[PDB]
């Protein structure tokens, strides 16, 4: 689960939502979504879950990213899907390079992991690809 | 999650696993893996975890299989993804099925819940598939 604060980029309106919100208002945004070769397609939240107070560990990657979610979260990595929780400084995760251009997503390496923290926590359905980019990072869904 | 001694069909092979030995052994099987419009496939399983001990219930589905799987756990219903946890007897789920008569050939029809079961602690796991993001388990298809 993601902790509440999360944001998340909607590229078909270019609006970024915290995703207690979304949740919250059960607001049908798209998000970013990572198929299975590393390309990025718009799909939809199809249902939101309110996941309830749960403890969360935090990624700071570099670049100034800091990802919370429960240590079960599965992260893209170098090597695949990975428990958030099984993470150490030094592993890279997946990120999408700048939309400006400025051969879609580029690994980053974790710069620390954060103690563990009690945190409001949500999840939401992406139709199809199961995945989405949460606080810069592609996380699973 | 699902609870330990929970089957895995792997419709390539005709074998029927329980998840705690494909984690445990790292077993890249073959399952029963939804797709989008409803159709079935089969998809290697490319990741495993071992999720400890957690509270899981119980759904004996018509057929007789038993799904334990912690409450917040995904499983495919015609109204989309639901938590385990909410499901009612009488509620149907997705269980795939080949022709009998009366891309895989399995076809997605759907089964309803014969009882629901109390919380047990169980260890649990879970597995990754490639693409789809989905498998069958105790005959159900379920959220991975
Ligand atoms: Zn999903
Ligand atoms: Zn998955």
Known sequence: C???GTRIFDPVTGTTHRIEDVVDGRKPIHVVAAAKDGTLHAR?????FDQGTRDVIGLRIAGGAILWATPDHKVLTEYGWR??????????????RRFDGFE???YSVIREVLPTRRARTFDLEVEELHTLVAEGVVVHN
Do not use: F, N, Y
């Open 44 to 48: 939809p939240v199809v249902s939101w």
């Open 2 to 4: 993601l902790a509440e």
């Open 83 to 96: 428990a958030a929780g099984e993470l150490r400084k030094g592993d890279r995760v997946a990120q999408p």
């Open 104 to 106: 879609e997503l580029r």
